[PDB]
Design a protein around this ligand. Structure first.
Ligand SMILES: *[C@@H]1O[C@H](CO)[C@@H](O)[C@H](O)[C@H]1NC(C)=O
Ligand SMILES: *[C@@H]1O[C@H](CO)[C@@H](O)[C@H](O)[C@H]1NC(C)=O
Ligand SMILES: *[C@@H]1O[C@H](CO)[C@@H](O)[C@H](O)[C@H]1NC(C)=O
Lengths: 214, 182
């Protein structure tokens, strides 16, 4: 299923006037001007429930918006009202943007569903203490879970069969940018011979919970 | 079942630099971006190329529109600029660091605008131009951007690494350090 991904139609804005006194953080800086647009598809259950949300930004300001549940453009700040009024008086263009929840959002999800949705990468679990010699206080037990996808994961520490729910220090879910995540869920504890600390990892690429004792 | 996902088409045109960008995002990760100058689709992961295609000319067409609209916007705002938001920088490794086993240093640049930075990896105080790669400007939920720079390295207790980032919103470049600790 190697079909062609569709892009959203970028509408052309019109001239006319200016607005009085704009903002500008300043503090001495190079002048810059940015026209930026995010056409978002929000899937609540695949293509069953979908909502298109277009977001316009001029520099640091979000100024216009298109919520498919409205069906028209709506200014967020006054900088975007001219576009709202212009685009909204254009019937064809509206029927067109409205159609994009189907011609773009749904159409593309069916494509990505073949590979991005079902993507799974199993994690690598690794435990290990932290701090040289005695911590002169509680020591750190590190549960490293790296190289996984999707992000949904549960990593639980236990102490002698009991789940430790306090004393946890974590980086939280860390995104590497290459479609893999990682995370270190540490545990402030002083080691004690026959005593045991266990890390349990649950993730959709697994069939059964990964446990690692130390 | 319940499949919750978000696919985002992010595009921008920037001045005075005259830089443009068109990319697609899936759950926070880039699927692909179009090389505007070479007019070609660049998949984030090569394996992706075989399941779908995308006409790069459509990205260019869109950028042409962003270009036009920017002038309209500068007119409407009477060419009023704004502040340059400086980025946060975090240097981390991709996997647990074991001596002698090749690893990858990640330089995460976050929360900045406009979308332009100068980045330089330093290994033992000197720039590294081999075994480095980088992403385009990635969107965030808000109005700012994040970017990733990568460095292939071989863990050894004799080296110290640095990620030097420069941005118009910074007084002087921000240099984040990294070194192996057993
Ligand atoms: C929700 O989940 C799937 C996801 O593709 C959707 O197609 C289907 O209509 C719904 N089914 C159930 C059982 O929730
Ligand atoms: C645009 O900016 C200039 C210089 O800051 C100012 O003199 C001019 O009055 C502004 N335009 C309007 C319509 O206020
Ligand atoms: C970045 O690099 C360019 C060279 O390409 C340089 O001229 C510019 O001053 C640097 N500064 C920033 C803030 O990007």
């Amino acid at each position: 299923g190697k079909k062609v991904i569709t892009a959203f139609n970028e509408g052309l804005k019109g001239g006319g006037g200016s607005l009085v006194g704009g903002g500008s953080g300043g503090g001495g800086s190079r002048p810059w001007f940015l026209e930026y647009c995010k056409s978002e598809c929000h899937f609540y259950n695949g293509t069953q429930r979908v909502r298109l949300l277009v977001r316009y930004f001029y520099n640091l300001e979000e100024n216009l918006r298109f919520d498919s549940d409205v069906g028209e453009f709506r200014a967020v700040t006054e900088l975007g009202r001219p576009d709202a009024e212009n685009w909204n008086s254009q019937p064809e263009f509206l029927e067109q943007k409205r159609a994009e929840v189907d011609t773009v959002c749904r159409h593309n999800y069916e494509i990505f569903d073949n590979f991005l949705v079902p993507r799974r990468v199993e994690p690598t679990v690794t435990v290990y203490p932290t701090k040289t010699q005695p911590l002169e206080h509680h020591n750190l037990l590190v549960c490293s879970v790296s190289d996984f996808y999707p992000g949904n994961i549960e990593v639980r520490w236990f102490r002698n069969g009991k789940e430790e729910k306090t004393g946890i220090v974590s980086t939280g879910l860390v995104r590497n940018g290459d479609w893999t995540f990682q995370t270190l869920v540490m545990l402030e504890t002083v080691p004690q011979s026959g005593e045991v600390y266990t890390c349990q990892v649950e993730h959709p690429s697994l069939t059964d919970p990964v446990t690692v004792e130390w | 079942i319940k499949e919750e996902h978000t696919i985002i088409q992010a595009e921008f045109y920037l001045l005075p630099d005259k830089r443009g960008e068109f990319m697609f995002d899936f759950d926070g990760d880039e699927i692909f971006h179009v090389d505007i100058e070479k007019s070609e689709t660049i998949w984030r992961l090569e394996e992706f190329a075989k399941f779908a295609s995308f006409e790069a000319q459509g990205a260019l067409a869109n950028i042409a529109v962003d270009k036009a609209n920017l002038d309209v916007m500068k007119e409407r705002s009477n060419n009023t600029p704004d502040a340059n938001v400086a980025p946060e920088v975090t240097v981390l490794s991709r996997s647990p660091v074991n001596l002698g086993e090749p690893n990858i240093l990640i330089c995460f640049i976050d929360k900045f605008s406009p979308p332009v930075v100068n980045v330089t990896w330093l290994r033992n105080g000197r720039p590294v131009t081999e075994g480095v790669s980088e992403t385009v400007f990635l969107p965030r939920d808000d109005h700012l951007f994040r970017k990733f720079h990568y460095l292939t390295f071989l863990p050894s207790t004799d080296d110290f690494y640095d990620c030097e980032v420069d941005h118009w919103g910074l007084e002087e470049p921000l240099r984040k350090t990294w070194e192996f600790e057993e």
